[PDB]
Structure 1
């Protein structure tokens, strides 16, 4: 599972998720969004179930990106929540919440939701 997660993945938008799974449940790496207020790589940190149910279930996981790096600050952060499923078409299936830093009038409209599917090719 650690073997399976670690690597470079791509989502349907052409974004690039580069991750290492530590044996202790850690996720570390970089993210590059093909869309939005973003350019180049951004740090990411997250967690996964390092002793997943052996009954052929997926492995639960999450990570976060703060959309600040040396090129831009989009005053925002995305968390993806989902599962890794192994096999020859390996997948990370996620849903995500993007919160954007705001004042307390438009804070009702503070958070976007979506879904990303990450694969090992394309």
Structure 2
């Protein structure tokens, strides 16, 4: 993948969360997520996909991934998906927007989903 090397490794967001990812030659994203906030402790499994053959016109590299907030420690009955783009270079970034859906009753389903935005960098 063009950005396999660029994407693979450890990222930090503005909240102090840790995203550890391996990008596969085939478009796979695999790794672990550790949230600094919310009903979460330690690492959670993540999986996702990225564009392994992006445009060569200076566009970013589209990608996304999912965490279900269940591990051996806690279950927050929720899942977050991050949708965004990898921008390479000296200050590489992954700029994302995310949706967090909780399991709810039908009565509360209107309030099931949060939306936010996270920016990941290789330092901090």
What is the TM-score when the length of structure 1 is the normalising length? 1.00
Structure 1: stretches of 5+ with no match in the other structure:
none
The offset of 1:114, in angstroms, is: 0.1
The offset of 1:49, in angstroms, is: 0.2
Q: Deviations over 1:78-113 (max 9, x none)?
A: 000000000000000000000000100010000000
Question: What residue in structure 1 maps to residue 83 of structure 2?
Answer: 81
Question: What residue in structure 2 maps to residue 27 of structure 1?
Answer: 29
Question: C-alpha separation between the residues in 1 aligned to 2:57 and 2:111?
Answer: 40
> Which 4+ stretches in 1 moved above 2 angstroms?
none
Provide the aligned length of Structure 1 versus Structure 2: 122
Question: What residue in structure 2 maps to residue 37 of structure 1?
Answer: 39
Q: Deviations over 1:57-80 (max 9, x none)?
A: 100000000000000000000000
Question: C-alpha separation between the residues in 2 aligned to 1:81 and 1:47?
Answer: 10
Structure 2: stretches of 5+ with no match in the other structure:
none
The offset of 1:33, in angstroms, is: 0.0
The offset of 1:56, in angstroms, is: 1.0
What is the TM-score when the length of structure 2 is the normalising length? 0.98
DSSP-derived class of the 2:123 partner:
coil
